[PDB]
Design a protein around this nucleic acid. Sequence first.
RNA 1: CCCCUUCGUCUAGAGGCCCAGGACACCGCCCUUUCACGGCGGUAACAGGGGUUCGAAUCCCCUAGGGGAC
Length: 360
Amino acid sequence: GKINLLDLNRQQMREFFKDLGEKPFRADQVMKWMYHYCCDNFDEMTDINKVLRGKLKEVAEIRAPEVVEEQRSSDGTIKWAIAVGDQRVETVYIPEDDRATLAVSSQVGCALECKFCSTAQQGFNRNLRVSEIIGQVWRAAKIVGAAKVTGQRPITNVVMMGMGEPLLNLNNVVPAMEIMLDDFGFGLSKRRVTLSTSGVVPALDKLGDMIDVALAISLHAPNDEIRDEIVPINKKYNIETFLAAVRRYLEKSNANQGRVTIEYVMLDHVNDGTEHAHQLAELLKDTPCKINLIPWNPFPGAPYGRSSNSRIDRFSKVLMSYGFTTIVRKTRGDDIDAACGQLAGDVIDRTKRTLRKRMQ
RNA sequence: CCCCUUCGUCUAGAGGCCCAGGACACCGCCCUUUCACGGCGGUAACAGGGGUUCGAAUCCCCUAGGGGAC
Ligand SMILES: C[C@H]1O[C@@H](n2cnc3c(N)ncnc32)[C@H](O)[C@@H]1O
Ligand code: MET
Ligand code: SF4
Ligand SMILES: [Mg+2]
Ligand SMILES: [Mg+2]
Ligand SMILES: [Mg+2]
């Protein structure tokens, strides 16, 4: 029953050190070792006297989840499977010219049932602990830091775009993000830590009272009827209820700089027509934003196709004629099922999704 | 008895190069095309106090807070 320090943000680690009679600055010191240096062994922490180091071994540990698989894409993308009990979730490293980004998982699977997502096909088991979330970053930083490969930069950006809906795990997601932003943690910017959500609107309001981070929304449709089909949570919280919650978040936010990112997956002949772009432009006219079009990444048994490049191009041309910043998300790591939406992991579904499927 | 303390974080520094330079963070402006959040700016430190010197982040003394040898 040793306490894992990877579960604690700054505040909780101060109060940890206040107990057992130590001063607040110890929290600062140990976090620097853990996060600036990827240190999991108290012996190596020269900042601290040998008495307090031997004392920490008694009551504490630094335990990130194990990497059990690595795959490398031809485009530079790396996917790691991390062991989480008997199950697994994925972490994805994305090197770009001027930056490097890590996509992190928030849940063991997902319970939201989006029809175009491989993670949904796996079902849902549970939420990840803080240590299991920030541990992905820790473990990726250590692996990337060791092998000094050409064009393989340290992590500058983090996206909550792995397995699971982050807003359904605020207890653990928020503290993990706090450690990403903390100067004594990873020291990342507000503006380059982006949480993506499908729209759990009461939770988005809660998020606003807890932490300010960059925000992307999984819109994927120009109207409620199409969205009800592909992103079922739109039935409980429709587009306007969601867009309103977004505008509330933006009002308090330095991280978003006045703009939400609109995520929009391009499904062939479903939501991808010129007609739909016009309707989407109208829909977003009162929501300051940037549009990120995502070519659909396939998975086994999916009833969709990827929008052709010409259909995507015409869709974006339309949007640009309405004055919207419009970017096609380059597909990264699809040769190793690491592209957005292809993260299957290894999940034990607790929602009886399989036995429900056969009973129609 | 010996070493350590420079912007929020990590650092450049060796008596005039420094009213202290950089990276990232933070803040601000812009995003009507750099986006798996993009572009450009701006604020910001010599642990504290007192000596030495024409001149101190730098040399000396004390104090506060960390290590380390007997
Ligand atoms: C991280 C973003 O990826 C989207 N997403 C989910 N599944 C897929 C898929 N098969 N292809 C492309 N994008 C997908 C999201 O729903 C979210 O907005
Ligand atoms: C694979 S989706 C990851 C982010 C979030 N669950 C969303 O739908 O936007
Ligand atoms: S898309 Fe994001 S939310 Fe919808 S299912 Fe896949 S993961 Fe859960
Ligand atoms: Mg300092
Ligand atoms: Mg940005
Ligand atoms: Mg200055």
